[PDB]
Amino acid sequence: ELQEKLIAVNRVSKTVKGGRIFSFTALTVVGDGNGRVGFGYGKAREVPAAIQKAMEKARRNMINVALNNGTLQHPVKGVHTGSRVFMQPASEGTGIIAGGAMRAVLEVAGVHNVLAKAYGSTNPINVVRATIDGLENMNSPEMVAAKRGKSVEEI
Amino acid sequence: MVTIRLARHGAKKRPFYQVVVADSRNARNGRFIERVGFFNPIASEKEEGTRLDLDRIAHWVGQGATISDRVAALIKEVNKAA
Amino acid sequence: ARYLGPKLKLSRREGTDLFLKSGVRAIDTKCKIEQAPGQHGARKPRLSDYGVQLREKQKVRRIYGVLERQFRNYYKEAARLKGNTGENLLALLEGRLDNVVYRMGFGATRAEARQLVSHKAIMVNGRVVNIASYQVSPNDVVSIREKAKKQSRVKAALELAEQREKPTWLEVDAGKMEGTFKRKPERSDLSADINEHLIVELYSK
Amino acid sequence: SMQDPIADMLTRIRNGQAANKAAVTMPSSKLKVAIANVLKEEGFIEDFKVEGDTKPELELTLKYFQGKAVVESIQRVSRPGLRIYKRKDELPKVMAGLGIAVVSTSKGVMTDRAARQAGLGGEIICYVA
Amino acid sequence: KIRTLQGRVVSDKMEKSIVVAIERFVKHPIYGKFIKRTTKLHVHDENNECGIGDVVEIRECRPLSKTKSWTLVRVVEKAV
Amino acid sequence: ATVNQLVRKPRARKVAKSNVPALEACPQKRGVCTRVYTTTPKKPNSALRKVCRVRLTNGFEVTSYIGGEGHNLQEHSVILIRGGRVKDLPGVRYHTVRGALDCSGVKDRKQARSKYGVKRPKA
RNA sequence: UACCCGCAGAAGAAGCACCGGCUAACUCCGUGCCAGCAGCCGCGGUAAUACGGAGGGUGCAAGCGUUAAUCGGAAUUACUGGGCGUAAAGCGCACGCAGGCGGUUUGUUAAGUCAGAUGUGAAAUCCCCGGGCUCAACCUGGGAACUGCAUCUGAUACUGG
RNA sequence: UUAGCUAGUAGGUGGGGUAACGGCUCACCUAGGCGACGAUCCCUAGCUGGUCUGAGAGGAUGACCAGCCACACUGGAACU
Ligand SMILES: [Mg+2]
Ligand SMILES: [Mg+2]
Ligand SMILES: [Mg+2]
Ligand SMILES: [Mg+2]
Ligand SMILES: [Mg+2]
Ligand SMILES: [Mg+2]
Ligand SMILES: [Mg+2]
Ligand SMILES: [Mg+2]
Ligand SMILES: [Mg+2]
Ligand SMILES: [Mg+2]
Ligand SMILES: [Mg+2]
Ligand SMILES: [Mg+2]
């Protein structure tokens, strides 16, 4: 019922006394389509084995995101080691406007309308981390209402 | 020499003469004082193709402006038909 | 400014029936659908994200017989209009005369619709039009010419109109070979095999 | 030297929130008390009290909710090296209306939401979220 | 109801006329920092009652020389 | 930097440098071959690349590359040159246009004919 | 003249680029680090999907490509919106004029700041709602916009005097 | 990697001159005037509404259409 898709696959190497030892890495994102999204990173000698490992890694380490209506509550800015991510909620019907890694993360999470831009490095492993960081730190008016002790007359 | 004239606009074979008061030494489509109305020679017969601002024309004519022949014809036909 | 090459190569490339043929016969019997055109049509290589977006765009263009420049103008018109870009684009593609003539069934396909519209054999509100991509306003009446009334192909398409599923927003009178455009569709009547979302992000790269 | 005491105020809240301090203390001023009043009316701080006469000191009692700081991000916009003033129709909306922007207008120091309905606009002192 | 400008005088060495400098704050068009410019205007004056530095009221008038087009109205500072 | 520093000295914009200065904003430029010869490419390429020293109409002497199979560019032949560098040739920053002026199209060419000035075969 | 009608017959009407990856689309023959290709990485020294041809396909279409030029992507001059221990980047150190900035309270001013109004901000253009060329481009009515400037009246929290 | 520039030059009286104010001009008087908020000198350039691009800020640009300016083989002058 939940959706899963593969971000990128990369071949890595570890040289030994005999020579190189080739390996394959898989970055995947798993989301239920509501705002519960996670990512998994796995390593294996074979591409099917590597992608499978990332699949179970993503089912654990799931997070929850509070969405308004298929979109973000407010503009959000997610920063990881070398990647800067700016996402802001857009109007209905505008669709998803984001880079490769961010679009997959966003679409499996369940955000249909969003304007998202990536600054800094565009390494898939780090932009996915930055995107997850933004969806965390974004908040909901009811949790803010309890946070400030001011009820929900703000909106 | 202040005159109320027709400035030709619109595409070719479909004129959209533009009634405007202007100094007579300016170009036909050049600088003007103030737009007054329009006149559409196509005359589609489904919707009105002419609307003129008669009160501004009066403020100009009775002050010392001048009417061209076509604009004068427009004034008389608008009055008789409306 | 049209397509003149083989018809079912288009239906083959996107792998689905594109209604280019009249439908008097089974499309499977007429041609092998599960194969792509060409000597490599045996293989089905892994198609990328850009590939699937392009295939969706080309699928819509080949259903409606519209070229790329025309279609890009429709998208800009769709994006300018208030509402949602995906079904706005689909709504313009419906209002073309080819589609409305074809959908009301005076032409077996858009190509008969194209001949009928472009050969001055279609009147709208009693006015003769021969432009394929003339938008149809709601409450407009499209009828066959009295000269064109006595041609075999038009009456032949009326039976195929029944053979397929009737459009709810078009009211036809085959007794005098006429039809009425009550209003535009709402994207709930149209086929769901068209993913209009991919179109927006193809043209919004 | 000391050239932005309002920036000092905002930094003390931020550092107190990060370090989970119950209270902060800092020399008082009229604009400082006005900003503290705005935060108190808005629900971002527990309570402020002014003590002393020759050298006043604001003792602010910070606020917490579960294990997280109440103030996600507090920052200064108008600064001594760059003054920022905004009109009525260009007041910013920090975090789409779920945060506040302290605004010094002619009537008094107050939030953007209240200034936008009073129809004043003015200087943008701080963003609180 | 008459258009007037403030300033402070910078020189009075020339006779029957003074130079005044109008100060103003203007937003920088690009960087948004309030910089201050200066508008040094030559101002005609009778009786030579403007010194150095004293604030001055001036008004635009008809041209009186090559560079002078402004005249005194009132003075509000005196005796350094 | 600081806003004050930026008011004193604004952001200087990077000045863009053309890769084909001898064209000087012209799509093509006419010249005459002042020398026609072949030169070896830098490694890891190995060939006999057909090039020509050409003096242009604006007095800019520059080398250009003769694309395609077979040319009849003698010395002093007047041709048209266009932009485009040959990577494995240091300094050869222009391509000769085939099918224009004295330069002739590549014979027995059936694909990409417009890029080599080859008329359609009478078939 | 647009336009309308009558005539005869599929009869007068499809090309260009590309197919190694970036990027949609693959095989065979020739050739053998040669000929050549190439925007970037690069390909070719005997199974070359990268060269030349041919079949197949793809994209656009009365056009298609190449070159030139502008902006974008380039947050790659970063005002919005960047950095300076080691990647480029903290003056060898200090004093100091101009300049930039400035603790805290009261009064006053109203220069910055903000609110209102008035006059301007030509038309065309751009945008919105319509109208007319059979559609469209095109033309066109009204509106919005041009929130920039100037003046007058007012507010005094912040900055300045 | 242009730091000083100015002698009708800056101002005043008086005469003349212009449709009109004005060193516009002349005689005399004073020693002023501009400049690091870039004077002076050097290179380039018609300006604008707009156009192209950009999410915006902005960057490039000023062909067609409209406003203004300046020129009419080169230099100068007046006449009507
Ligand atoms: Mg065309
Ligand atoms: Mg930039
Ligand atoms: Mg950097
Ligand atoms: Mg080093
Ligand atoms: Mg270093
Ligand atoms: Mg040091
Ligand atoms: Mg102070
Ligand atoms: Mg004021
Ligand atoms: Mg206008
Ligand atoms: Mg004199
Ligand atoms: Mg010039
Ligand atoms: Mg940008």
Beta bridge partners of D27: D57
Specify whether the CB–CB gap between E59 and E71 falls below 8 A.
yes
Specify whether the CB–CB gap between D98 and A74 falls below 8 A.
yes
Contact E33/D82, CB-based, under 8 Å? yes
In chain C, residues preceding a discontinuity (C to N beyond 2.5 A) are none
- For D83, the closest chain E residue by CA position comes to E33
Q: What is the dihedral of CA F52, F58, F59, F61, to 10 degrees?
A: -30
* Burial classification of residue C183, based on how many CB atoms lie within 10 Å of its CB (0-12 exposed, 13-18 middle, 19 or more buried): exposed
Distance E42 CA to H37 C1' (A): 17
- In angstroms, what is the C-alpha Rg of chain D? 14
Q: Which of residues 98-157 of C touch A (CB under 8 A)?
A: none
Is the bond into C45 cis (omega within 30 degrees of 0)?
Answer: no
Q: Rounded to 5 degrees, what angle do the CA atoms D9, D11, D14 make?
A: 115
CA–CA separation, C37 and D31 (whole Å) = 77
Q: Do chains F and A touch (3 or more CB pairs under 8 A)?
A: no
* CATH at residue C33: 1.10.1050.10
Experimental method reported for this structure: cryo-EM
Where along chain D do the CATH 3.30.1370.30 domains lie? 1-71
Domains and CATH numbers, chain F: 1-123 (2.40.50.140)
Please give the residue range of the domain that contains residue C199.
Answer: 7-93+190-203
The backbone torsions φ and ψ at residue E26, rounded to the nearest 5 degrees and listed phi first, read -135, 140
| A70-102 residues labelled b (16+ CB within 10 A) or e (exposed) | ebbbbbbbbbbeebbbbbebbeebbbbbbbebb
Specify whether the CB–CB gap between E34 and D83 falls below 8 A.
yes
Residues C176, C147 share a domain? yes
- Report which of B15, B2, B22, B21 is spatially closest to residue B50, judged by C-alpha positions: B15
Structure tokens that stand for A135 in this block: 């969806």
Contacting residues for A60 by C-beta, under 8 A, at least 6 apart: A38
Q: What is the dihedral of CA A67, A135, D124, D6, to 10 degrees?
A: 130
Q: Rounded to 5 degrees, what angle do the CA atoms F103, F108, F112 make?
A: 75
Residues C105, C79 share a domain? no
Structure tokens that stand for C68 in this block: 């790329």
Q: CA of A95: how far to CAs of A136, C183, F11, in Å?
A: 21, 27, 36
Residue C147 belongs to some domain of the structure? yes
C-alpha F61: how far from chain center: 12
Contact D81/E32, CB-based, under 8 Å? no
D43–chain A Cβ distance below 8 A for any pair: yes
Residues C136, C76 share a domain? no
E33–chain F Cβ distance below 8 A for any pair: yes
Residues C173, C101 share a domain? yes
CATH of domain D72-129: 3.30.1490.10
- Strand G: which bases are under 7 Å from protein Cβ? 4-6, 14-18, 22-27, 33-44, 52-62, 64-71, 74-79, 82-84, 99-106, 111-116, 122-123, 127-129, 131-136, 138-141, 151-152, 154-159
Contacting residues for D73 by C-beta, under 8 A, at least 6 apart: D127, D129
* Burial classification of residue D63, based on how many CB atoms lie within 10 Å of its CB (0-12 exposed, 13-18 middle, 19 or more buried): buried
CA–CA separation, C47 and C53 (whole Å) = 10
Task: Answer for E14: CB within 7 Å of strand H.
Answer: yes
CA–CA separation, A134 and A119 (whole Å) = 14
CA–CA separation, D93 and C166 (whole Å) = 52
CA–CA separation, D6 and C203 (whole Å) = 49
Residues C110, C56 share a domain? no
Q: What is the dihedral of CA E4, E9, E13, E17, to 10 degrees?
A: 0
CA–CA separation, F77 and F31 (whole Å) = 8
Helices (H), ranges, B1-67: 54-61
Specify whether the CB–CB gap between D44 and D70 falls below 8 A.
yes
**CA atoms within 13 Å, Cβ hemisphere of A110:** 18
Residues C67, C22 share a domain? yes
Distance of residue A75 Cα from the nearest chain C Cα, in angstroms: 21
CA–CA separation, A36 and A110 (whole Å) = 8
Residue C101 belongs to some domain of the structure? yes
CA–CA separation, D123 and A58 (whole Å) = 47
Q: Does residue E32 sit in helix, strand or coil?
A: coil
Report the separation in Å between the CA atom of A121 and the middle of ligand 5, taken as the mean of its atom positions. 22
CA–CA separation, D25 and C180 (whole Å) = 79
Distance of residue A89 Cα from the nearest chain D Cα, in angstroms: 10
Q: What is the total count of domains within chain C?
A: 2
Helix (H) or strand (E) holding A143: helix A141-148
Q: CA of F25: how far to CAs of B51, F19, F54, in Å?
A: 51, 11, 18
Residues C156, C143 share a domain? yes
Where along chain D do the CATH 3.30.1490.10 domains lie? 72-129
Specify whether the CB–CB gap between A31 and A5 falls below 8 A.
no
**CA atoms within 13 Å, Cβ hemisphere of C56:** 20
CATH of domain D1-71: 3.30.1370.30
